[PDB]
Curated annotation (Swiss-Prot):
It comes from the Eukaryota. GO terms for molecular function: ATP binding; ATP hydrolysis activity; calcium ion binding; P-type calcium transporter activity. Key regulator of striated muscle performance by acting as the major Ca(2+) ATPase responsible for the reuptake of cytosolic Ca(2+) into the sarcoplasmic reticulum. Catalyzes the hydrolysis of ATP coupled with the translocation of calcium from the cytosol to the sarcoplasmic reticulum lumen. Contributes to calcium sequestration involved in muscular excitation/contraction. The gene is ATP2A1. GO terms for cellular component: endoplasmic reticulum; endoplasmic reticulum membrane; endoplasmic reticulum-Golgi intermediate compartment; H zone; I band; membrane; perinuclear region of cytoplasm; sarcoplasmic reticulum. It is an enzyme of class 7 (translocase). Residues 70-89, 274-295, 778-787, 852-897, 950-964 are lumenal. Mg(2+) binds at D351, T353, D703. This is Sarcoplasmic/endoplasmic reticulum calcium ATPase 1. It comes from Oryctolagus cuniculus.
């Protein structure tokens, strides 16, 4: 730790005893680690307080049933008719279903956090440091950075520790400090000191804070402090504003829940109210209060039964299960709604380089000018072997190896690639491979300079660590880089102003070396470098240079091309304004053309398969890239966006082609064009913004700082694991696997969660309709009471409980990836689905009342027939039908209540077997597609047998169901509910026309 930030650049270097160009010694590092510890912060928390997650009794529908358990517990405190054994089990049956789902919800949610944290250890963050054991920059694990290290950071990098800025290698350094200071805009830094030791972090405009991201520039610095002493570590476990929000679907269901709970409120009043004439009946002594209290209980028992109380627990389960499946697909879910929103996605925007391609850059062809005579232009065209960043290859002309030093044009070409370059090359001794340090478009050029070896440098006795930057360092010693005109993306160019090293070994004057996209650079070239001389640019030579780039980009290799050029007469150093990012283009004029490199970039093997599945699922894919239009369309054909010989005139625009269009035509272009090339960061955002104007659900995919604005505005933003930290900050989901096909399975998971809620609702609603049809149909037809406060509570537990919750684990419906995407405008329940809710609930409520009735009439077992009976309650109360045979107290017998309740339980277990799909019959999706449903079904059925055959229980409930002909009648009544919905699924299966 250096206690202050206010020290000069010399003092910070002297406080630790370190060299600005060497870095810490391996001895200083070993001795700082055991003194200052690693660069770590403890895992913030596990988020499972063992208490905070259990307390999910917070939704309305759960704390309603908590109310019912209180009043049924107080009504147990008043004892009537020895109901104590039955009154005190009333609140426990209510609480048991609430506990049954709370166990599942807390399980799947902790089980999902176990997978997210386990995916943080996947790819450990690393930094860029200078240390004495190596001569060039080195990749080390970020936790190993100690104070005193010399750390280098550039665009996209996340700052690994608090750093005092020693030197800024760009014209301006701009940092994103939104996470720490709240400054929602990039801010400028500098190296001049600030004196106040207490000046707040906004005033410390000379340092870089851990956790913050570098927006623009490239700077060198020294690590002030690491670990929990970091300015962000002081706020890890202390200050924060934790962001939690309900998803668009989770909020839609809270609306559906509250409006439904008030409808049941009217029902349970309409049930209490219709039985006003039964308050004085002699079942409870005729007392008005001792009769009204009883029917107040059945309204409570009807409410908790009708209320779908597993809803807030099954939503948490499906979301936690979806996050846990994407974490198993190596996909970090940074925002919870991202899995469900990506399901109804209709348009996928996608970056080209790195995103759709492997970003395994390697130069394979290059060319320089051979002859210029009138209209004739001749090219010295070379081929380069080697497909990795290893400096192991040969340069070939006419299919035989040549020495790059022969051709003077190749010397200047290697000199441009080596100098105009902010990326180096580091050897990983563990992996044994050379890794890119910096942007891959530049490391590709770094490897080319080593393969060329244009000065014939003794590289044979160099170690595999020293060999990486061998031939580059030779060129970096010939001319000194005075300042860099960094990469802008307005002009699509990078430039450097260099001077000869000794001013005596070379007095050739100053030079600027510029590389950038060919179309912009060649327009700014008035000259052509032929050998060691210079000729004026002409029409013929220009078209020849352009026609080769057009062939290399549209050929079978779809090559990425850069242009290399030197300015021979640069402005004097004092003459240049290093402030305006707009004027840098002017400085890059009157250039002399050197050559063009053709780089190789293989598309990811998963891409072509992943687009096939998007078009079948009705999801349109658009390539968005800054790269050449010729290369962009060619890559689209290779990956499958376009046909091998499809015409593409109307569906591919450049950046300027797009902006020449009026606004109305720009939007129409976004709705037909699948390829946008030569775009800028603003173009990427406006394309997504136009797609959202058509109420599309747009998803952006990108990895570099290039397309961070497009990732934010898009409904869902997916970043690559290899990408910059700037993009990962702006993404709601990260693919640590770089596996593009994970996006498709996420769309499947996003569709499956919705299709599994549509069945959780179809089950409980249609099942609980019959539970309300039952209650009204008996009181309306004059039939006696067929259920009991504790009987509704039992049907609630074994039918609205785990069998309902286990519907969340339903597999994806068959044609879920063959139907077009869901519009977020669609209603939760359609006009047709509300019909099937009633057609089932009707037969559920009619089959349960006809079960107790059948026992009265056709039983001819135990009690006998009552073939056409008005069933007046009084008949046994007092003979009033003038019957010679009155059948005293045959009403209210225990067998019909048991008879009706078994149907009402079995018919809903049968109904759950239809809740596997929305329209697919059991012929195509059998009941064993969800094992955990069949487990919960046996759970309800057997646990229902205990309250009928272990002897002390059928007195708390009412008595046994008989042996053979009673369960056969319950079963033969219930099973037709499957055939009913089976027909209803067949009707809609072939009646979608309209
Ligand atoms: C003899 C005649 C038949 C008798 C039948 C009796 C049934 C007895 C056994 C039942 C076991 C079935 C329980 C099913 C639970 C329903 C919810 C559910 O489907 O869950 C399933 C998850 C699965 O795990 P996964 O998603 O990670 O696998 C993913 C693997 N892939 C991806 C391939 C799917 O498992 C989880 O959620 C976590 C598991 C925790 C279990 C919670 C449920 C237990 C509840 C206990 C309280 C009830 C009190 C009882 C009252 C009586 C007085 C004592
Ligand atoms: N470090 C760099 N230095 C100089 N020129 C670069 C460069 N990186 C890219 N270029 C060229 O300038 C142009 C503008 O850069 P750009 O924004 O287009 O990145 P890009 O589109 O090539 C990566 P992506 O396809 O992921 O968007 C590119 O076409 C490229 O040929
Ligand atoms: Ca219920
Ligand atoms: Ca990219
Ligand atoms: Ca039920
Ligand atoms: K957003």
């Amino acid at each position: 730790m250096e206690a202050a930030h206010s020290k000069s650049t010399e003092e910070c270097l002297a406080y630790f005893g370190v060299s600005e160009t060497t870095g810490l010694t391996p001895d200083q590092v070993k001795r700082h680690l055991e003194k200052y510890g690693h660069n770590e912060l403890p895992a913030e928390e596990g988020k499972s307080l063992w208490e905070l997650v259990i307390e999910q009794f917070e939704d309305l529908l759960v704390r309603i049933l908590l109310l019912a358990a209180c009043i049924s517990f107080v009504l147990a405190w008043f004892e009537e008719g020895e109901e104590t054994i039955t009154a005190f089990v009333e609140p426990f049956v209510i609480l048991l279903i609430l506990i049954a789902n709370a166990i599942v919800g807390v399980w799947q949610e902790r089980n999902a956090e176990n997978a997210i944290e386990a995916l943080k250890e996947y790819e450990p963050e690393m930094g860029k440091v200078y240390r004495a054991d190596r001569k060039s920059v080195q990749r080390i694990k970020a936790r190993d950075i100690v104070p005193g290290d010399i750390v280098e950071v550039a665009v996209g990098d996340k700052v690994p520790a608090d750093i005092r800025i020693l030197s800024i290698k760009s014209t301006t350094l701009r940092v994103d400090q939104s996470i720490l200071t709240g400054e929602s805009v990039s801010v400028i830094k500098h190296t001049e000191p600030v004196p106040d030791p207490r000046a707040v972090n906004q005033d410390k405009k000379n340092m870089l804070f851990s956790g913050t991201n570098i927006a623009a520039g490239k700077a060198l610095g020294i690590v002030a402090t690491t670990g929990v002493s970091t300015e962000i570590g002081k706020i890890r476990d202390q200050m924060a504003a934790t962001e939690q929000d309900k998803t668009p679907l989770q909020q839609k269901l809270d609306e559906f829940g509250e409006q439904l709970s008030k409808v049941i409120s009217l029902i349970c009043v309409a049930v209490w109210l219709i039985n006003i004439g039964h308050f004085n009946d002699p079942v409870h002594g005729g007392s008005w209060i001792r009769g009204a209290i009883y029917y107040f209980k059945i309204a409570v028992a009807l409410a908790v039964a009708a209320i779908p109380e597993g809803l807030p627990a099954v939503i948490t389960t499906c979301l936690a299960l979806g996050t846990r499946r994407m974490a198993k697909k190596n996909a970090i879910v940074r925002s919870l709604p991202s899995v469900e929103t990506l399901g109804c996605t209709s348009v996928i925007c996608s970056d080209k380089t790195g995103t759709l391609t492997t970003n395994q850059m390697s130069v394979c062809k290059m060319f320089i000018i051979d002859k210029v005579d009138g209209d004739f232009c001749s090219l010295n065209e070379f081929s380069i072997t080697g497909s990795t960043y290893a400096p192991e290859g040969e340069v070939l002309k006419n299919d035989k190896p040549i020495r790059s030093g022969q051709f003077d044009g190749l010397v200047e070409l290697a000199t441009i690639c080596a100098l105009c370059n902010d990326s180096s090359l580091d050897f990983n001794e563990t992996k044994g491979v050379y890794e890119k340090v910096g942007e891959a478009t530049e490391t590709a050029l770094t490897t080319l300079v080593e393969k060329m070896n244009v000065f014939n440098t003794e590289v044979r006795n160099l170690s595999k660590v020293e060999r990486a930057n061998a031939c580059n360092s030779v060129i970096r010693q010939l001319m000194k880089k005075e300042f860099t005109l960094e990469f802008s993306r307005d002009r699509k160019s990078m430039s450097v102003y260099c001077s000869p090293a000794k001013s005596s070994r070379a007095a050739v004057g100053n030079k600027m070396f510029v590389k950038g996209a060919p179309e912009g650079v060649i327009d700014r070239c008035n000259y052509v470098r032929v050998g060691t001389t210079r000729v004026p640019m002409t029409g013929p030579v220009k078209e020849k240079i352009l026609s080769v780039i057009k062939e290399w980009g549209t050929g079978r290799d779809t090559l990425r091309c850069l242009a290399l050029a030197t300015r021979d007469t640069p402005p004097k150093r004092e003459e240049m304004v290093l402030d305006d990012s707009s004027r840098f283009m002017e400085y890059e004029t009157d250039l002399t053309f050197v050559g063009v490199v053709g780089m190789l970039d293989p598309p990811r093997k998963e891409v072509m398969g992943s687009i096939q599945l998007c078009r079948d699922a009705g999801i349109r894919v658009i390539m968005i890239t800054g790269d050449n239009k010729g290369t962009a369309i060619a890559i689209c054909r290779r990956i499958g966006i376009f046909g091998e010989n499809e015409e593409v005139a109307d569906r591919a625009y450049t950046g300027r082609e797009f902006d020449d269009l009026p606004l109305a035509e720009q939007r129409e272009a976004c709705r037909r064009a699948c390829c946008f090339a030569r775009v800028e960061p603003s173009h990427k955002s406006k394309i997504v913004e136009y797609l959202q104007s058509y109420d599309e659900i747009t998803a952006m995919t990108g990895d570099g700082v290039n397309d961070a604005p497009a990732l934010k505005k898009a409904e869902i933003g997916i970043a690559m694991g290899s990408g910059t930290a700037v993009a990962k900050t702006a993404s709601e989901m990260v693919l640590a696997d770089d596996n593009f096909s994970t996006i498709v399975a996420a769309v499947e998971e996003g569709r499956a969660i919705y299709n599994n809620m549509k069945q959780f609702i179809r089950y409980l609603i249609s099942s609980n309709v019959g539970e309300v049809v039952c209650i009204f149909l008996t009181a309306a037809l004059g039939l006696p009471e067929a259920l009991i406060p504790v009987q509704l509570l039992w049907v609630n537990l074994v039918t609205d409980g785990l069998p309902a919750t286990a519907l969340g684990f339903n597999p994806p419906d068959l044609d879920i990836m063959d139907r077009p995407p869901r519009s977020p405008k669609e209603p939760l329940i359609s006009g047709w689905l509300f019909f099937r809710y009633m057609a089932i609930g009707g037969y559920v409520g009619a089959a349960t009342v006809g079960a107790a009735a059948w026992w009265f009439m056709y039983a001819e077992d135990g009690p006998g027939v009552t073939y056409h009976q008005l069933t007046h309650f009084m008949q046994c109360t007092e003979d009033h039908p003038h019957f010679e045979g009155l059948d005293c107290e045959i009403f209210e017998a225990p067998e019909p209540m048991t008879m009706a309740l078994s149907v009402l339980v079995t018919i809903e277990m049968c109904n759950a077997l239809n809740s596997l799909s929305e329209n697919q019959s059991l012929m195509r999706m059998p009941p064993w597609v969800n094992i955990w449903l069949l487990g919960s079904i046996c759970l309800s059925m057997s646990l229902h047998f205990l309250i009928l055959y272990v002897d002390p229980l059928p007195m708390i409930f009412k008595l046994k169901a008989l042996d053979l002909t009673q369960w056969l009648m319950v079963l033969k009544i219930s099973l037709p509910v499957i055939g009913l919905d089976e027909i209803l699924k067949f009707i809609a299966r072939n009646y979608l026309e309209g």
